[PDB]
Amino acid sequence: LKNANLDPKTRVLEHRLLAASSAIAEKLGVSAGDEVLLIRRLRSTGDIPVAILENYLPPAFNDVSLDELEKGGLYDALRSRGVVLKIANQKIGARRAVGEESTLLDIEDGGPLLTVERVALDNSGQVIELGSHCYRPDMYNFETTLVA
Amino acid sequence: KNANLDPKTRVLEHRLLAASSAIAEKLGVSAGDEVLLIRRLRSTGDIPVAILENYLPPAFNDVSLDELEKGGLYDALRSRGVVLKIANQKIGARRAVGEESTLLDIEDGGPLLTVERVALDNSGQVIELGSHCYRPDMYNFETTLVAR
């Protein structure tokens, strides 16, 4: 919504190259042990927390830097590497905040979060990016329009 | 099929009431017009899943208890020669309040997935308003977005 999109700012919480587990490899369509990138970001609008964003990037995009991610969006970084999004599959759910989430998002302990599980695909059906995101629902909701 | 759990529905409330300014605005009618409120509990097998709430405009305010026993709301609207063309949905999350936690068999203050829905027909007439909440361990909203 309007407030969330007003003044987007990002702080990187984690940026870590790691060996893809068989599970992660299968989801990305790559090989187990491949060098993939885990990123975790706190997204704000100005000083107001909005979301915690988590992604896995496959080896082709594992050189996305921490600085790129605090200066611009994930898709700015991906676009500079020739990515063209064709399909985004998203599953929207909800859950309680756990661990440090309520502190990072400045909400109540055990308070509700909106969740997104995301798989983004290019035109050849290859996985661009896997997302697992959570949003404070007073700052962000998902809007859709279906036409029969 | 052996592991499938069939959807179940029971009617909690079915009453004609005067449209508030907000409801009238959303339906495209006059404040105070006679609208139908329907509330239902939807379950999956034996497990409560969703509290469904709908408002129907005067044209459709005769949907009966009997037709809600025999089919859903859209079966009833189909009987009236009404077919859905457009659905706008807003997906959020919040805490369960009041009898919501006992209706859904969850914790008081536990998270709920929410949807606000406006359904329109091919003439752009609002057919139905929905305001639903779901146990998020039993239900998620799946979406696919295809870039052109």
UniProtKB/TrEMBL annotation, chain A:
The keyword Magnesium does not apply. Keywords: DNA-binding, Transcription, Transcription regulation. One of its GO terms (molecular function) is DNA-binding transcription factor activity. One of its GO terms (biological process) is negative regulation of DNA-templated transcription. This is Transcriptional regulators. It comes from Corynebacterium glutamicum (strain ATCC 13032 / DSM 20300 / JCM 1318 / BCRC 11384 / CCUG 27702 / LMG 3730 / NBRC 12168 / NCIMB 10025 / NRRL B-2784 / 534). The lineage of its organism: Bacteria, Bacillati, Actinomycetota, Actinomycetes, Mycobacteriales. The chain holds residues 105 to 252 of 253 of the full protein.
UniProtKB/TrEMBL annotation, chain B:
The chain holds residues 106 to 253 of 253 of the full protein. It comes from Corynebacterium glutamicum (strain ATCC 13032 / DSM 20300 / JCM 1318 / BCRC 11384 / CCUG 27702 / LMG 3730 / NBRC 12168 / NCIMB 10025 / NRRL B-2784 / 534). The lineage of its organism: Bacteria, Bacillati, Actinomycetota, Actinomycetes, Mycobacteriales. Keywords: DNA-binding, Transcription, Transcription regulation. The keyword Transcription applies. This is Transcriptional regulators. The keyword DNA-binding applies. One of its GO terms (biological process) is negative regulation of DNA-templated transcription. One of its GO terms (molecular function) is DNA-binding transcription factor activity. It comes from the Bacteria.
